[PDB]
Design an enzyme around this catalytic site. Structure first.
Site, PDB file in Angstrom:
ATOM      1  N   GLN A  43      19.154  79.352 -32.655  1.00 13.83           N
ATOM      2  CA  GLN A  43      20.225  78.998 -31.713  1.00 13.83           C
ATOM      3  C   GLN A  43      21.499  78.503 -32.397  1.00 13.83           C
ATOM      4  O   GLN A  43      22.528  78.388 -31.737  1.00 13.83           O
ATOM      5  CB  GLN A  43      19.769  77.906 -30.727  1.00 13.83           C
ATOM      6  CG  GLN A  43      18.578  78.271 -29.780  1.00 13.83           C
ATOM      7  CD  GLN A  43      17.209  78.108 -30.436  1.00 13.83           C
ATOM      8  OE1 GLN A  43      17.097  77.736 -31.623  1.00 13.83           O
ATOM      9  NE2 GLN A  43      16.144  78.435 -29.677  1.00 13.83           N
ATOM     10  N   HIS A 127       0.132  84.959 -28.137  1.00 10.73           N
ATOM     11  CA  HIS A 127       0.541  84.596 -26.782  1.00 10.73           C
ATOM     12  C   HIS A 127       0.104  85.634 -25.748  1.00 10.73           C
ATOM     13  O   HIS A 127       0.198  86.823 -26.007  1.00 10.73           O
ATOM     14  CB  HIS A 127       2.047  84.414 -26.682  1.00 10.73           C
ATOM     15  CG  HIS A 127       2.584  83.320 -27.554  1.00 10.73           C
ATOM     16  ND1 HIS A 127       3.933  83.136 -27.775  1.00 10.73           N
ATOM     17  CD2 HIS A 127       1.955  82.355 -28.262  1.00 10.73           C
ATOM     18  CE1 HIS A 127       4.110  82.105 -28.578  1.00 10.73           C
ATOM     19  NE2 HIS A 127       2.924  81.619 -28.898  1.00 10.73           N
ATOM     20  N   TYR A 158       7.140  79.227 -19.539  1.00 12.54           N
ATOM     21  CA  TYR A 158       7.321  77.764 -19.420  1.00 12.54           C
ATOM     22  C   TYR A 158       7.787  77.317 -18.033  1.00 12.54           C
ATOM     23  O   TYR A 158       8.788  77.833 -17.491  1.00 12.54           O
ATOM     24  CB  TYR A 158       8.283  77.251 -20.511  1.00 12.54           C
ATOM     25  CG  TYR A 158       7.881  77.736 -21.878  1.00 12.54           C
ATOM     26  CD1 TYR A 158       6.550  77.616 -22.307  1.00 12.54           C
ATOM     27  CD2 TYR A 158       8.805  78.343 -22.723  1.00 12.54           C
ATOM     28  CE1 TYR A 158       6.144  78.095 -23.551  1.00 12.54           C
ATOM     29  CE2 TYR A 158       8.422  78.821 -23.999  1.00 12.54           C
ATOM     30  CZ  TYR A 158       7.094  78.696 -24.389  1.00 12.54           C
ATOM     31  OH  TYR A 158       6.675  79.145 -25.618  1.00 12.54           O
ATOM     32  N   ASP A 223       0.797  75.579 -23.196  1.00 16.64           N
ATOM     33  CA  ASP A 223       1.996  74.890 -23.650  1.00 16.64           C
ATOM     34  C   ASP A 223       2.755  74.353 -22.431  1.00 16.64           C
ATOM     35  O   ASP A 223       3.286  75.126 -21.626  1.00 16.64           O
ATOM     36  CB  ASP A 223       2.869  75.882 -24.435  1.00 16.64           C
ATOM     37  CG  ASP A 223       3.964  75.219 -25.266  1.00 16.64           C
ATOM     38  OD1 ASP A 223       4.311  74.037 -25.043  1.00 16.64           O
ATOM     39  OD2 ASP A 223       4.508  75.922 -26.171  1.00 16.64           O
ATOM     40  N   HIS A 225       5.422  72.475 -22.736  1.00 25.07           N
ATOM     41  CA  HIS A 225       6.794  72.728 -23.180  1.00 25.07           C
ATOM     42  C   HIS A 225       7.744  71.743 -22.534  1.00 25.07           C
ATOM     43  O   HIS A 225       8.807  72.121 -22.024  1.00 25.07           O
ATOM     44  CB  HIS A 225       7.212  74.180 -22.876  1.00 25.07           C
ATOM     45  CG  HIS A 225       8.218  74.732 -23.839  1.00 25.07           C
ATOM     46  ND1 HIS A 225       9.571  74.493 -23.721  1.00 25.07           N
ATOM     47  CD2 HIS A 225       8.065  75.518 -24.931  1.00 25.07           C
ATOM     48  CE1 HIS A 225      10.209  75.117 -24.700  1.00 25.07           C
ATOM     49  NE2 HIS A 225       9.319  75.750 -25.444  1.00 25.07           N
ATOM     50  N   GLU A 275       6.753  70.832 -32.410  1.00 26.36           N
ATOM     51  CA  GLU A 275       7.724  71.879 -32.789  1.00 26.36           C
ATOM     52  C   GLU A 275       9.173  71.377 -32.781  1.00 26.36           C
ATOM     53  O   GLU A 275       9.987  71.842 -33.574  1.00 26.36           O
ATOM     54  CB  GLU A 275       7.566  73.170 -31.968  1.00 26.36           C
ATOM     55  CG  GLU A 275       8.029  73.013 -30.518  1.00 26.36           C
ATOM     56  CD  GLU A 275       7.624  74.147 -29.654  1.00 26.36           C
ATOM     57  OE1 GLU A 275       6.401  74.496 -29.671  1.00 26.36           O
ATOM     58  OE2 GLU A 275       8.500  74.662 -28.912  1.00 26.36           O
ATOM     59  N   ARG A 296       2.640  70.109 -34.946  1.00 23.93           N
ATOM     60  CA  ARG A 296       3.170  71.431 -34.643  1.00 23.93           C
ATOM     61  C   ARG A 296       4.526  71.759 -35.257  1.00 23.93           C
ATOM     62  O   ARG A 296       5.199  72.665 -34.782  1.00 23.93           O
ATOM     63  CB  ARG A 296       3.325  71.576 -33.123  1.00 23.93           C
ATOM     64  CG  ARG A 296       1.993  71.568 -32.367  1.00 23.93           C
ATOM     65  CD  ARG A 296       1.410  72.979 -32.263  1.00 23.93           C
ATOM     66  NE  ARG A 296       2.320  73.883 -31.562  1.00 23.93           N
ATOM     67  CZ  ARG A 296       2.586  75.138 -31.930  1.00 23.93           C
ATOM     68  NH1 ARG A 296       2.033  75.674 -33.033  1.00 23.93           N
ATOM     69  NH2 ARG A 296       3.433  75.863 -31.194  1.00 23.93           N
ATOM     70  N   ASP A 329      11.167  83.222 -33.508  1.00 24.16           N
ATOM     71  CA  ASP A 329      12.306  82.697 -34.255  1.00 24.16           C
ATOM     72  C   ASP A 329      11.883  81.968 -35.552  1.00 24.16           C
ATOM     73  O   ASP A 329      12.053  80.758 -35.752  1.00 24.16           O
ATOM     74  CB  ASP A 329      13.252  81.879 -33.357  1.00 24.16           C
ATOM     75  CG  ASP A 329      12.541  80.779 -32.562  1.00 24.16           C
ATOM     76  OD1 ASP A 329      11.466  81.026 -31.975  1.00 24.16           O
ATOM     77  OD2 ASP A 329      13.106  79.673 -32.526  1.00 24.16           O
TER      78      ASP A 329
HETATM   79  O1  LIG Z   1       4.954  77.297 -28.867  1.00 21.97           O
HETATM   80  C1  LIG Z   1       5.963  77.946 -29.146  1.00 21.97           C
HETATM   81  O2  LIG Z   1       5.944  79.009 -29.764  1.00 21.97           O
HETATM   82  C2  LIG Z   1       7.336  77.344 -28.823  1.00 21.97           C
HETATM   83  O3  LIG Z   1       7.296  76.590 -27.631  1.00 21.97           O
HETATM   84  C3  LIG Z   1       8.445  78.414 -28.785  1.00 21.97           C
HETATM   85  O4  LIG Z   1       8.146  79.357 -27.766  1.00 21.97           O
HETATM   86  C4  LIG Z   1       9.857  77.851 -28.568  1.00 21.97           C
HETATM   87  O5  LIG Z   1      10.175  77.661 -27.247  1.00 21.97           O
HETATM   88  C5  LIG Z   1      10.934  78.709 -29.206  1.00 21.97           C
HETATM   89  O6  LIG Z   1      10.560  78.964 -30.507  1.00 21.97           O
HETATM   90  C6  LIG Z   1      12.357  78.162 -29.143  1.00 21.97           C
HETATM   91  O7  LIG Z   1      13.201  78.941 -29.935  1.00 21.97           O
HETATM   92 MG   LIG Z   2       5.417  75.331 -27.933  1.00 18.52          MG
END
Ligand SMILES: O=C(O)[C@H](O)[C@@H](O)[C@H](O)[C@H](O)CO
Ligand SMILES: [Mg+2]
Ligand SMILES: O=C(O)[C@H](O)[C@@H](O)[C@H](O)[C@H](O)CO
Ligand SMILES: [Cl-]
Ligand SMILES: [Mg+2]
EC number: 4.2.1.-
Lengths: 417, 416
Positions: A43, A127, A158, A223, A225, A275, A296, A329
């Protein structure tokens, strides 16, 4: 090889998988000897490029690349202010490239510098998604057929919202079809609308279905999230105990980590977090207090292999396992870095994996071999990965800004996405 | 009605010899614009990228009145967050929106925030020197100017001084009489300091200063994360007798847990926080009353919107504000600090770095400094402007600082 010096530091921006990536290449005064690192904060790729090209390059040129820790410790404080995602990714690009160079010098993969293999392959999860429970079920069957023994299961990605934003995973995903959200006010401010409570209620229904149809042998991840209030997440964790998830991920935002104290007094569902983490003061109280079972972090976003090693050890000594971020990403260099950590850590937990297309494998020779739900790293020196700069140029970054991160609840409130 | 943001741009200028970043937000109301500070001096070019490439397309077309909505959505726009480059981009925007709101209201920002809580803003300034006498001499000069609060360092931070003009646009002498440990027979390049020789010198400095100057003058000392935590704790205890206004940054943000031990033992007032970028740094300190003053760099925590929240959280815990006020803050940021200062019940003190004529010329509306107090003008918004043509005459130097490469006697790269 004496008098070894860094001669050039460059940023390569490329998107062969349809997602903007940033990679760092560090050249040395030894002909043919270079390293690669991942700096992918997708981003903000142009700002990461600026941090690398304007700041890291003059900081490094002329220095001995052997001194990874000294370069890391001095680089981290070079701008005084620190502990942020743009800064960290710049350091990660450098740090991973230095580990890459050291492994090349040693004639050893990085996992070997770090203590050698602790396992015979790296178990993966991938996923699965869908607009209703049956589509999620169908997708999990297809992944199980491919040999995956662990899967993340979302219905509507999400918060049940799905996504139309290709910047997220390069693919559109349906909104949850049958979730009935609350009615919004009569005019709405633009955003991606979602209903946290309708989402929360749908999750136990999803897992009840999936467990009935698929049994308990298959490992399941979900997740959250950061999409719900903390007490809602606590209740969710309790109602999901019966479905025996491998982990429930990101029940709270980093800004709400204190709430895990309450969660862990009440629930025995395994929890993963992190994350989004960029600061020791986010992860250390969680690990110190056993408030999570898996950490994570996005390795480049905490600053590379050097800090990830330390986090893996801190978690190890507290009985916490690793689950490094493995989304779309992240470059193949970062996927390799996660995996060299994975293979050398006694306390590896799981590797999230986002399958690559042929373009990624072509632009980055040396991508890990994926065979029946396990990853097998090659045994080439360093990270065992390379980049073809000419081929990378065929996939220029799209740049711009994402839309998915503007998430609004039914009343129009801008929410943590 | 129908008020919209039309343009967002970054102005990079160095009129005081220090790289500044300012954001200007234009609107579809002719003549109506706002200014904000985005000054993270060591990373100005990355901040400019963050503003120009990301904030600008996020904002154009939106209603600037919704400051809180713009901040809450902007902070999560890139998903990852809580860092100094991201926060400074957000601050430039946030402060400009507060500026615009005040201009619309015909009121200074302090008035939007609840009005004046005091009749002027007390300041502290910096005094330094190579020995105790030079420090004392400098304090006397500042007292003659009306300062009632002064920071006192001997050899700046860690006793090392500085030759690096990027830091404050002045060379400061290393401490003359501090005898460092011998280094190994070859040294990796850096600015060498000795934390132990530094730590032992501080109570001697204050013993001298209190003898010569008395206890009416208020003294601040900045440890600037230079020593081990237990050494900082012992330093706090040995300094109690000198009744400092505060001892600043005894620990690094990465070591905040050590304040639990410090506060079991010492009653020297403590400040922390110029380095903070994350709620998980300051929230445990304030919740547990581990500091007496919060020191955040307002732009580096994301602007007026988050600083106000931090001031209130501190207020409810009996903690007072001491916003960061170095040379690396634009006059727009100086004004933002002071608008908060004047409207906060729990204001503590305002660190102040005097400006030269060029800063005052480039930024019309600089606060009036009169015998140790600052007096904001009563102009709407932040009461500050920028002359863009005059700003262009002071281009940024860029490059990288040298002072942040701090090494102990054995060569260890240290938190500077
Ligand atoms: O568990 C996951 O893989 C993460 O939640 C990603 O889905 C992020 O949302 C994303 O990488 C943002 O850029
Ligand atoms: Mg995640
Ligand atoms: O108390 C202070 O003013 C600070 O410690 C500054 O001197 C910082 O070091 C500077 O702002 C970094 O750029
Ligand atoms: Cl950052
Ligand atoms: Mg300070």
């Amino acid at each position: 090889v004496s008098n070894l010096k860094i001669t050039n530091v460059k940023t390569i921006l490329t998107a062969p998988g349809g997602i903007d990536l940033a990679v760092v290449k560090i050249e040395t005064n030894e002909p043919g000897l270079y390293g690669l690192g991942c700096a992918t904060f997708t981003q903000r790729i142009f700002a990461v490029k600026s941090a690398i090209d304007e700041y890291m390059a003059p900081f490094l040129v002329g220095k001995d690349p052997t001194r990874i820790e000294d370069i890391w410790q001095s680089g981290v404080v070079s701008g005084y202010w620190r502990n942020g995602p743009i800064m960290n990714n710049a350091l990660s690009g450098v740090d991973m490239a230095l580990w890459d160079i050291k492994g090349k010098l040693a004639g050893m993969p990085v996992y070997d510098l770090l203590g050698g293999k602790c396992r015979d392959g790296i178990p993966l999860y991938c996923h699965t998604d869908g607009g209703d429970e049956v589509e999620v079920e169908d997708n999990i069957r297809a992944r199980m057929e491919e040999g995956y023994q662990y899967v993340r299961c979302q219905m509507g990605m999400y918060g049940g919202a799905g996504t139309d934003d290709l910047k997220l995973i390069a693919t559109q995903l349906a909104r949850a079809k049958n979730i009935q959200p609350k009615r919004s006010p009569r005019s709405k401010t633009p955003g991606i609308y979602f209903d946290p409570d309708a989402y929360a209620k749908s999750v136990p229904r999803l897992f009840d279905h999936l467990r009935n149809k698929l049994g308990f042998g298959i490992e399941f991840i979900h997740d959250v999230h950061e999409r719900v209030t903390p007490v809602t997440a606590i209740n969710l964790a309790k109602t999901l105990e019966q479905y025996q998830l491998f982990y429930l991920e990101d029940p709270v935002a980093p800004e709400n980590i204190d709430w895990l104290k309450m969660l862990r007094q009440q629930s025995s569902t395994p929890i993963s977090m992190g994350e989004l983490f960029v600061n020791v003061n986010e992860w250390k109280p969680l690990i110190d207090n056993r408030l999570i079972d898996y950490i994570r972090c996005h390795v480049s976003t905490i600053g590379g292999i050097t800090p990830a090693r330390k986090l893996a050890v801190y978690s190890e000594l507290n009985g916490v396992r690793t689950a490094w971020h493995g989304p779309g990403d992240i470059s193949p260099v970062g996927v390799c870095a996660n995996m060299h950590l994975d293979l050398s850590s006694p306390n590896f937990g799981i590797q999230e994996y986002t399958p690559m297309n042929d373009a990624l494998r072509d632009v980055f020779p040396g991508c890990p071999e994926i065979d029946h739900g396990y990853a097998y790293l090659n045994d080439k020196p360093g990270l065992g990965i390379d980049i073809d700069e000419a081929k990378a140029a065929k996939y220029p970054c799209e740049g711009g800004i994402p839309s998915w991160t503007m998430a609004r609840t039914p009343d129009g409130t801008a929410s943590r996405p």
